[PDB]
């Protein structure tokens, strides 16, 4: 039931950006290390999120996914029941900052995200 799938650049508290494979389908953003034989990193539950644009210095196009009550946006278990996620740079409990490599790509993602919410 995939709606969009692409590499996206993701950051947390740290200034560092990590390029990860994200699959958008109804209700969830699924994050993997690779498109192919991906190790599951985490799943964002869109039901718990709001989305806002986040204009910035390293931009491409930049937006923010967050829990309005600053609670967890993350699914407890993997799409295949995976107990624990693959190691990445530490990501925030209650938000993701996201930029697509191209601004036009970023805009489609953001617009797409609003629907899947």
Author numbering: 8 to 124
What do the authors of the reporting publication say about this deposited model?
To understand the structural principles of ER–PM tethering by ORP5/8, the structure of the ORP8 PH domain was determined by X-ray crystallography. A distinctive feature that stands out, however, is the presence of an unusually long 25 amino acid stretch forming an extended β6–β7 loop (His209–Ser236). Comparative analysis of electrostatic surface of ORP8 PH domain with Osh3p PH domain reveals a distinct positively charged cavity, representing a putative PtdInsP-binding region. The analogous surface on the Osh3p PH domain has a neutral charge suggesting that ORP5 and ORP8 PH domains may possess a distinct PtdInsP-binding mechanism. Close inspection of the distinct positively charged cavity of ORP8 PH domain shows the amino acids forming the basic patch are lined on the β1–β2 and β5–β6 loops (non-canonical mode). Structure-based sequence alignments of related PH domain containing LTPs ORP5, ORP8, OSBP, Cert, and Osh3p establish that the putative PtdInsP residues (red inverted triangles) in ORP5 and ORP8 PH domain are not conserved in OSBP, Cert, and Osh3p. Notably the side chains (green triangles) mediating canonical PtdIns(4)P interaction with OSBP, Cert, and Osh3p are missing in ORP5 and ORP8. To confirm the importance of the non-canonical basic surface for PtdInsP binding, we designed point mutations R136Q, R179Q, and R158Q, R201Q in the ORP5 and ORP8 PH domains, respectively. Both the point mutations in ORP5 and ORP8 PH domains completely abolished the binding to PtdInsPs, confirming that ORP5 and ORP8 PH domain follows a non-canonical PtdInsP-binding regime. While most PH domains (including Osh3, OSBP) utilize the canonical PtdInsP-binding regime for PM targeting, the PH domain of ORP5/8 possesses an atypical PtdInsP-binding site that does not permit PtdIns(4)P binding.
